[PDB]
Write a protein that binds this DNA or RNA. Sequence first.
RNA 1: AAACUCCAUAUAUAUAAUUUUAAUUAUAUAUAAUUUUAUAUUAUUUAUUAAUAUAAAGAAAGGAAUUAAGACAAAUCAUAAUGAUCCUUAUAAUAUGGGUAAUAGACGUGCUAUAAUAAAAUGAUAAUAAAAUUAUAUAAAAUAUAUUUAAUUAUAUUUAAUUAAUAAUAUAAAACAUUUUAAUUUUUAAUAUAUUUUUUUAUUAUAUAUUAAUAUGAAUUAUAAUCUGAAAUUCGAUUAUAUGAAAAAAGAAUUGCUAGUAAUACGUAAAUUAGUAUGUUACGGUGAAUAUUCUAACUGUUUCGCACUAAUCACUCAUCACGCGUUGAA
RNA 2: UGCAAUAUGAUGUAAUUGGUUAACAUUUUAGGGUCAUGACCUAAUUAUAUACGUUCAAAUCGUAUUAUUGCUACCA
Lengths: 403, 49, 41, 81, 104
Amino acid sequence: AKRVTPGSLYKNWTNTTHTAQLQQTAVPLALPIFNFDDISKTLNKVVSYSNKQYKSLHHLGSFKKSQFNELFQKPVCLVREDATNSFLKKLVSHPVKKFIITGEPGVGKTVLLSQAHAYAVDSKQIIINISYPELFLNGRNDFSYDDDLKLFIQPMYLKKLIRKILKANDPALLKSIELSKDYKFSNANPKNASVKPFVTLNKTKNTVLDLLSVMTHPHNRGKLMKAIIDELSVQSKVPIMFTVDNFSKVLTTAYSAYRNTENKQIYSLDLQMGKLMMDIISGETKFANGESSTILAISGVDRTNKTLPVALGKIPVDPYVTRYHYEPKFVELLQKGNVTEFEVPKLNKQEVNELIDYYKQSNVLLDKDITGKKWENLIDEKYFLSGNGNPRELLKSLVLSHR
Amino acid sequence: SANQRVSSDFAVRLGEELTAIAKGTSSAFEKRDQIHKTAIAHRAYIQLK
Amino acid sequence: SLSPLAQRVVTQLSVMSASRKQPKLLKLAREDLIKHQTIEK
Amino acid sequence: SRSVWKGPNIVPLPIREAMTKGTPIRTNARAATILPQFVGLKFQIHNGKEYVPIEISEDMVGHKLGEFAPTRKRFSYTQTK
Amino acid sequence: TRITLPRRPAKKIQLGKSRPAIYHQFNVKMELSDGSVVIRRSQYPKGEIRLIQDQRNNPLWNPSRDDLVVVDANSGGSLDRFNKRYSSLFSTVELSEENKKKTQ
RNA sequence: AAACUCCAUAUAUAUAAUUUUAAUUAUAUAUAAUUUUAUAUUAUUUAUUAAUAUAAAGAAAGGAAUUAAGACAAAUCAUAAUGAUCCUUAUAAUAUGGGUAAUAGACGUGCUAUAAUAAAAUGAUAAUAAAAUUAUAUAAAAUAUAUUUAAUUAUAUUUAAUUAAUAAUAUAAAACAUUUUAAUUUUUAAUAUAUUUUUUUAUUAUAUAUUAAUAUGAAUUAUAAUCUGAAAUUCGAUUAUAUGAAAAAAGAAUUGCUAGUAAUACGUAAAUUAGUAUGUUACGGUGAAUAUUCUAACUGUUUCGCACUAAUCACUCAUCACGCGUUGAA
RNA sequence: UGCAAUAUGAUGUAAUUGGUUAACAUUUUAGGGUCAUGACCUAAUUAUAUACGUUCAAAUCGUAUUAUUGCUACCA
Ligand SMILES: Nc1nc2c(ncn2[C@@H]2O[C@H](COP(=O)(O)OP(=O)(O)OP(=O)(O)O)[C@@H](O)[C@H]2O)c(=O)[nH]1
Ligand SMILES: [Mg+2]
Ligand SMILES: [Mg+2]
Ligand SMILES: [Mg+2]
Ligand SMILES: [Mg+2]
Ligand SMILES: [Mg+2]
Ligand SMILES: [Mg+2]
Ligand SMILES: [Mg+2]
Ligand SMILES: [Mg+2]
Ligand SMILES: [Mg+2]
Ligand SMILES: [Mg+2]
Ligand SMILES: [Mg+2]
Ligand SMILES: [Mg+2]
Ligand SMILES: [Mg+2]
Ligand SMILES: [Mg+2]
Ligand SMILES: [Mg+2]
Ligand SMILES: [Mg+2]
Ligand SMILES: [Mg+2]
Ligand SMILES: [Mg+2]
Ligand SMILES: [Mg+2]
Ligand SMILES: [Mg+2]
């Protein structure tokens, strides 16, 4: 009957490679540690993250599927000098810190986001990451309408996100912040459920560390998150870095699959988790701390419309385009906050050389390119097959494409 | 032998089977053996044409 | 073991029948019997 | 189904004698619609070789005169075995 | 080939114990086509009913009346849709246009 | 029979004042191949020889048109034309309708299914074609409604440009990312986990309860409604809500294909139309594996027999049934 | 006033130390067919007869229905 014995691969190829521990057999290798203050020391080297960075970048969701993260013991990055250094340097020194990462599919838009998150944990910042925004726009989660907060709330995703924040961010950095207002929530904790129906918070005596810990009801979880974000906005002690990946989904999907009570489709801005995420990029949510920083990243698994080109000024404005392919409200929200782009440059021959060197050291290549090939010929051929420096195509050439 | 596995994806099933054969747990070695034994039995009928 | 048509017709003939549907016999005191006799006359 | 905006299919056929007198309307116009005015009138619709008599009912309205005059009659296999 | 339900042994109803049959009936009100109402005894648990077609709106029972509208069941079948489907033509113009055919 | 020929191949030359741009093109003429050599090995009519080996040089490898004489009294007097006949107030002419369309069991050739090496939804700086059509046309954009932001599909409203290497039919589609996807407790929730977070590990629910009956299939029906036409009743194609049957990969047997072929849930155009292709005729995209030992089956010749010769569908042996003749016996 | 054996068919038919189907054949389904006769497939019928006992096994022992054997009575 139940033919699926425990420990048997039953999902698709991608899911199996992503979940099943295919890295249990990987070869350990001593590599440098990713640190920005030592970037001059590891400018062009395939460096591995630290244990702090690895514990983070996991709750945040910085490492995704279909990245070949399982060919090695743990995810690794090349640092580079025209993408990582050129990005983090302006992130440190730019008067207004809000950027969007662009480029061709497979360039490394995510990996650069993960590097930014690693820099944040190194630099003692509170990180909020939304990663795949399709989860709260597809319709596979619960929702309700909040009368006071005149918006739609999604308690399941809200619970997951608050748990992400709490489990990733440093307890010391979170406890360092003291509450500014007093919040009264309902109680959903099985312990002390009957004795008290509402939990209470107090000014300058409780903290955000237990603000996140409080467990409330689905209908009040929206106000819970409002409190989280407003307190983090008014704090000015430690920086807050807010990040959304696959921002193409949101700027191309204005209307969610979530359907109103009259056949209407609820607007993303009318739905919370879109209003919160868009007001911060636009500038309605002001962070007191000087170096809060905001980062966005588009994905190649998403259709393209004129919205982002018009927002970034790459093409003029055509007012006759249909809403399915141009959204003036999204453009206006993006332009009110002075977001500037950042196109990730593709690899060079030298970057391909170092990557292939590391791959050989880790034994992820073949006899084809280890026995009968000369290094110059191999690097030239792979640079040519990778579309002149596309990391995903380079990996696919080296490992996946076997003939 | 790979189609007798569970995974809904042929790539996964085939990879599992190839891994099994690489570690020498194939279920067709006995088929090779039966064919080879039959050839050993019929050696006599061989007639160089 | 009966058919649904059999059950339907048994219900119909239940509506026919007097079983488990009639009330107790009407027993009247002597005075009320005389009253009724006068009414009818 | 004929488009409604075009209007019902109407052909010149005699109705004045049909109402004033009891004269039935014999016709070959099988494609004409049965308007509400024909109820109670006797029609003789051509079926191919003979005229079938039919009286118009309030429910026939909207149908075609030729729906009640079968042109071919039923098949019967003579097995003889 | 016949189907019958079996006979059970009949309960004996003795001489003098045999009561009459008084089935349960209701004093139901029955409204005719006009405003008239008749009280009657019915076994259905419906104390009130109205009729759309009945004696009070039948030509055979109502010869003297000049005008008498007829009606049938509503919200059933495709009735009256042969009129609802054609709005351009509406009620005397058609009567005038049906003057004659001029055929011989 | 081969060559000659047409579509394809390469080169050149000539035309286009490169805004009919496709110069990566169009089509006029010519050249080239039915490929050359060089050593090797078996051999062998001796070198003058082939079958291979394959250093070399070449762009060089296909397709279709053409199917003789005789035949099968093969099909065609319904493409038209014809000899004999046979209808001449019909067997010759017109219109209204109804036939060709009916349905018990048969039988061909096709279309659509029966799920995870596979079917749906999305992919706007619009991934990538070829060959045709448009004066008895064509339908761009745009605007309205089905349906709510759009979009996408169906209808209407206007009709732009072009009788066309210029407008239009027409943003090919499959591939390829992504999401999903019942049988499947292989799943989804609730809380907890933590360095798998689009994720896994716990304890509970998801259990009328593991070997076929969906979130596959789209036949059959109900009802709006819309095209074309004077007019879909018998009988035409369309979207909409509902309906949701058989099918759980198929028995003797059997069909087509040897390379740009088969296959393709790959699409595209034209002819026949006022209108309606699961058919026909053409165009390109992606692209295989299989073969040098079988009895059989057809043929081209051959060798053996022949009493057939309008030739094996040949010819040819009787007594029994029909009529007439002659001779026996008795 | 007691007792015996029968039937999966359109033409009857399995058998002996315990779970599961009980030939043919029949028929439009028909084999291999040079349109073609004339040898499976494909196309019909068992459900251990309505009761009783057991290990996760009762054709097996009783009664009873479809009803044709052979003794005694045969000086009623
Ligand atoms: N070592 C190393 N690998 C990298 C780097 N950038 C990209 N890669 C590799 O290339 C892959 C590219 O995937 P992503 O990093 O998600 O690239 P992307 O451009 O965000 O891709 P899309 O979102 O699908 O458009 C990564 O998964 C890595 O395997 C880098 O800086 N260092
Ligand atoms: Mg990314
Ligand atoms: Mg020739
Ligand atoms: Mg010939
Ligand atoms: Mg003939
Ligand atoms: Mg003729
Ligand atoms: Mg026909
Ligand atoms: Mg044919
Ligand atoms: Mg499918
Ligand atoms: Mg389909
Ligand atoms: Mg395209
Ligand atoms: Mg073209
Ligand atoms: Mg248009
Ligand atoms: Mg598709
Ligand atoms: Mg379906
Ligand atoms: Mg259909
Ligand atoms: Mg159909
Ligand atoms: Mg056509
Ligand atoms: Mg020859
Ligand atoms: Mg010959
Ligand atoms: Mg005696």
